[model samples]
Target: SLSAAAQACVKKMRDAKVNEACIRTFIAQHVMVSKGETGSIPDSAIMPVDSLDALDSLTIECDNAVLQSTVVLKLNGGLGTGMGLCDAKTLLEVKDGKTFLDFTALQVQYLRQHCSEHLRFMLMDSFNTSASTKSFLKARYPWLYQVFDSEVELMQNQVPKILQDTLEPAAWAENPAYEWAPPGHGDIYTALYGSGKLQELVEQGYRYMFVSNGDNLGATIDKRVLAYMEKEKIDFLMEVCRRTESDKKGGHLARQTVYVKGKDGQPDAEKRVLLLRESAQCPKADMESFQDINKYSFFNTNNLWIRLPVLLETMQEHGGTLPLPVIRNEKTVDSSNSASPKVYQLETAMGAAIAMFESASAIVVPRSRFAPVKTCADLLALRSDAYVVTDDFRLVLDDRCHGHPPVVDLDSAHYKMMNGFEKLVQHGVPSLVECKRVTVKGLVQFGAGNVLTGTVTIENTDSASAFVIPDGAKLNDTTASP
Candidate 1:
């Protein structure tokens, strides 16, 4: 059944004029069983972050002159499918009824005040997200088109999904779209070049770019980081944060050796190659070693600083393709069904491009820069008083909590999806100003004007009952025991 689908998919890809090289690369990555065929990186090879003093010395003013040469590229391709939303993920309301797109626009507007003319804001949208996102942005900010120009929007292309068993593109009669999946955010390079945006930017004299996820409010452009990149003239810079237990499964920064021929046509001295190794790329045998915090002390935040000219040159070196580390993800053709035909999601990470550049570097940024809302727990934390929204709409953990941010454990059976989460907290969410941890076991409801202080845990302890905190209830440091 899948063999015919695979043949059809290959023909479809060719008919659509998909890049031959990209298709070949996907075919090669599909054969790996572990998807971690790339060997594990040694602990000793990871590069330590440079001292703060050294970084501080490189910082320069991010004035109008600097802003003139810089562009902000946002990854706005997600559909929030995990949270059960059919629209663009950024369209979902985040804080004070303002959507993630609203906060992003606010940030961009704030920065534009410094120099609106030369500054540019671009979004790398997927086919599923582009049209509506563009419509919303145009309706909300009428001046955006005039300010950023037409090249402000680019697309991340989709590739056909390959069947896990037959190594062919999977076809679903219910929805043909299911036969295709995003080629990952790493497609930014190919998308930019293919769309002619890279050349357009170069012609416009824009040299530097800051790329980050649209969902991460904390990833707003940092002046110091921009100044550091500009002053040092670094080709690529990845912002890294100190890894904690929570980040053990994320991609880590490491170094390896690569040998190249010298002028004499003989192997030269081995050079250290800086790279990012994601959890999916780590061998199962080294899973324990890979999770060791002391060994892989830093994790990639996906906040990248790139020089456009250098990026173009690198792509040219690889015959117009950015040689990124391929990530082979296997999933059911219909994501909702476990018994469905298995398919491969051939993906890549933008940070993995670190290995392609000789001048790549990583900086240890504060924990505040790495906040991402992946789960409903993260949504609860951000929506509560634990994190405050600044005037610019960036979410920041309140300084009072200190140490690690509050831990939130919500029952997945009830509050895992966005619709359920929103319905439960419609009355009003509990105050999390001083909450160190929150654990809601099953079917818990919150009342209006409820104040929950430090170390709070509300458990129904009943299988068929719903627990509700009465109106104006003040549960301060409450305990399960007398």
Candidate 2:
């Protein structure tokens, strides 16, 4: 009696007589495509090292490469809860006791101390980051802060902590609680613009703005990259690097196919923009198989530069709120019965980030400039085999040899670490220093840097959350028979 409910589908052509009312409603608000696609670059597209060398040999492009007016400082918001410590983790975790901020500032401070050419230094900061970051800076360069534009300015780049329907901060929804995820570093665009610092930067004669995140201790000032940008007369440039196995979960900079409305208010034939890690850019094939995925191969260094005037214009024209894609993953919750809390994948569409420049407008720079660290493990990789956390690497590499290693200094590092350890011990925190210190002592001691100690135990029965035993946590050895 039933033809197994044979399906009758209506063709789009059958409804060519479209409803203008429905169409107008759709056009009232913009739509951002959520699909991600694979990135593609021909094998011959990238220049080989030697070709680059040849180009380098031919062009004496930018000797006065460093901009006079523009200030290039790394974005220094390094507070991740899991990473331990409350302040900008950058200020807390010192390489050899030098807070990440100290290590970073050393490069700039050394430049100021040694180089004659005056280059303005500015830090993009928010209330969440400014205090701790400045505390460290003011201690050393109090005068620098006193300068008219020497200090860090505020720009609150907050991502809604809650899911879309809830729009509540995720920290409220979870146990450990997360205040907010720094609105993808891209949010820096909006912060820089809204702060009115851009006009100040322009007034200072800084034509190009080089922006990079602070987590990457490896990302140093690249005079050559600046030179290349200057020589190419590029308006916007993004730093991308070749990815290694260690770069899991990092976003790729690729072409994104998206939908837009045409003059007639119809889906303007699909278009593409230079997509930063938005999941909307990866191809289904790449997402499923992770095969032939050039997207993964080309990672966003999160290092970008924009011509100030062009940047200002773009931001001013479209500064009103637009959706900024943020990262969300299913978080496991600790529980009694159903141990694994199901993670709810969500999309929180907020306003446009002040930091994101139009992708189509940005030119691609070699990935070498985008070095970043997302975890403690990355620190080990950046520290290198010698284990000496020194600014000499930037001196030799970034400055392109000529000067003797910019006088390697670790005094600040020593003090910061000594202070951190002393504070921990005074509190009777089971100091990793008491025992783990033994593991890292002597010539075989895996080099000199800040040492971290904690007892991290995995519960076999639970997969929802992780437990850490800091130095002070009580030890249970009463049952030991051995």
Candidate 3:
């Protein structure tokens, strides 16, 4: 049924010389996994992680010498369109006049001083983001060019969007932009292999790589964790945090019980494998089980570690593809338009590679290591007293508050986009360090130095609020008006 679509994809990719191996893998995903095949690990076959490792238990410290052989990768491809950002999201100034990339540069400089001066820092950028980031980096941080041993850019690829009804490539004559879609971060492996960067890194004697999202300033490389992975000789490792009510929608990790052929295929003699299921991968029937925070106690932070040789060999063995499980994302070809035609943008996840590898592992880490801003609510919490930037540029919790970040629920009507959100917080972000929850019910303006000590709510009494919280006002548990 998708045979013709496969040809269309192959032909398009062949013109660009994307490499035939990558094209075949792209075709393989649509034909096999995204088609009626199951990527789900049912509740019956999966169980909670009762015996997983914790980050605190790793006591081994990384030597400065080991830093020379390690490389750090940041997935910096997001356009931040959801947040109403026109350029790369990392360009947004986050704190004290420092953008996300600025903090990352500070982080790399810190490592260069204390650890290896020759440490390699790479950015996995898509075509859409690499142009803007390269210019931004060169103008502001020219000194960073000196640290890299080789090229600093590892580019990601894009794939065609398939029409939902016809199961063929989606086409729009009026707007050609809607015809293409990103192949997902799962393409990191494909990008590395396809671009020859993976083989080069292995040949360069870099054995371990740490990976995280572009905007998460919290997951800077920890020497202990790197030391732990090296000491254990792990092939692949992922850092995760214990799931809470607030993290219900994030992807969770679990172990699936399986029987080996050598063990007579018996249930009594079984082996368990690491599995990661995102909300997109969860089966329809298993939605309730998937959302239950207690059942699936740990969610992925997207911070990952990989052994270079093992990854290289695995990709070679599989004929140049990671063969990660297909993540079928249903989206309108024009994502921003509500009435746009629907299409299937099949992609894969790097975390899904855990299931395909035998030596994969995961660990539960503290909440401090997992802070990422995915929404306006999260950005508010990050901007306020809830988080503080240290001397070295890592964003951590304010000293007095507990480990957890304050929960923020903003009414989307007034705060969904940066345009409206920016106007509201123009005075300054209020004190959220001592607050438990801040719920903004309607249109309201924030005043300077407003201390939200406890659970506070600001409600609009009219159709559109003229209400503005008073400057330097102390807001407690009760709701308030202008």
Candidate 4:
């Protein structure tokens, strides 16, 4: 049933030819394993979750059984436009001497240091990504850089023009931030296929692909998680986390069906997803259903476990591509023309079909593995205790942390004068905070004239963290009701 909706989503994506050109470009100029043998896939990629009813008394034994040497797919295709920076998001420093790219690059090294298999790093970038990311990686981990023969290269982040009235594919723009869009990461299939890297994975006998974003730090490499994936023979495994207040940016896995025209000339193949969010997820909605929902409801962490074969086949079946929506937004900026209105479009990779597909297996991981860094305020909590940087070639997002993480005060001398922000325009003066535990790669944002009052956890494994509204307030909710 779920697969039907995915089929519709996939069909729409295929219809959006805006990405067709970008796919051609990626296929023309991509490289894999320019140096040594890329590593193997670990067992964790197929690990299963324990349940009481369908899965009774499931236990995960922490052994080297499923620890396949794996690769992490990171999107280094973004520029820090919102942050008022002229460089890639990877170059903007986050922690003590480490940038976002640095954090993820070393995270791969950390896994290899602890596990027995060879860990590989796949840095998916565009034109500027390779040079910027490589400079940092070489300065930090010369050995690892050489071992993989400096495999980091550029891919396409397609920005298709959108029809603002209704989000639909239109044309392309020249401005980088305004027109530059992420070529649906679902293109991971096309990017890998076109780049010929998928062939290397198959050749190296690495079956599983561990993919994630460069910003989220919560997808930790747990030994038990890996061991479970191996024994289950899972074709595709997605890491789903229990929804907390921070799940607004996350996509939920729901029951869905496909809507198609049947032989009777009537609409058929209607898919059903218990719920869907066309826009911002209203926290006030009935979020309780999110808790009772099991693996299906487990929201995507962006940390995907995909078997190389399934991904490759899926890419090939759809004319070597996947169709998807091209989203448009008025980008926030702070340039000479910062105050001017600018629009951008992005075709992002989504899990609509993946969620509905029967061939794909699903499991909800513990909250411990779903840490993310989106707003400036998120940094305070993510880095507080989730991870830490050990050295240039190593990183650790462990349970061990102290006094939570520190928050960045945007009102302070360092960031007081940042101008031309789109979100700041709507939210007023904003605060950007970074955490120390997650190794300093996230930003937490707090706004003026607004108040966040509740018990919130910066990291998943911690107890509720409480924050109170300030004394001065112009308005308050009237609790008295007839």
Per residue, candidate 2 scores C-alpha lDDT tens digits across 131-197 of 7666677786575556524445545454322222322222334553232334445445555655566
- lDDT for every model? 0.74, 0.42, 0.80, 0.46
Candidate 4: Cα lDDT at 105:
60
**Model 1 lDDT, residue 443, Cα:** 77
- TM-score for each of the candidates: 0.87, 0.57, 0.94, 0.59
Give candidate 4's error at residue 377 in angstroms: 1.2
Q: Tell me the spans in candidate 4 whose CA falls farther than 4 Å from its real position.
A: 1-66, 92-94, 147-150, 157-180, 257-297, 324-346, 383-482
What is candidate 4's lDDT per residue for 1-482, written digit by digit as tens? 32332233234445654355354432221111111112111222222233311111246744553456455567666554445555566564456566766667667766767664366667676655656667777788776567434454537545433333333333333453433355445556656776677777777766666777667655545555455666766566666665554454445544434465656856566633222221223133534433333433356667677778666676677566543322223343222555543433333344433542345555666554555665543543443324454443423344432212233223222222233222222333211122221111112222344322222222112114212222332222221111
Tens-digit lDDT track for model 3 on 1-482? 55776777677778757666668778888787436754565678777877788998888888866667789898887667767777777877788688888888888888877677777889878778777888777887887654332578877887888877656777777697677887878888888888788999989898888998887788878888878777777788889887865575458898877877565555465788888888877887879999998888889989998888899999898887888888777888888776877988888888877787687899888877777777777788888878988766788877776667888888888887888788779888899999988898778889998999788988886745457878898998979865
Ranking by lDDT: 3, 1, 4, 2
Can you give the lDDT of residue 407 in candidate 2?
17
Q: Which candidate is the best by TM-score?
A: 3
* Candidate 1: pairs in clash: none
Superposed model 2: Cα runs more than 4 Å off: 1-66, 113-117, 147-150, 159-163, 166-181, 256-273, 278-295, 319-371, 383-482
- For residue 176, model 3's alpha carbon misses the true position, in angstroms, by 1.7
User: How close to the true structure is residue 317 of candidate 2, measured as C-alpha lDDT?
Assistant: 63
In terms of lDDT, the best-performing candidate is 3
Ranking by TM-score: 3, 1, 4, 2
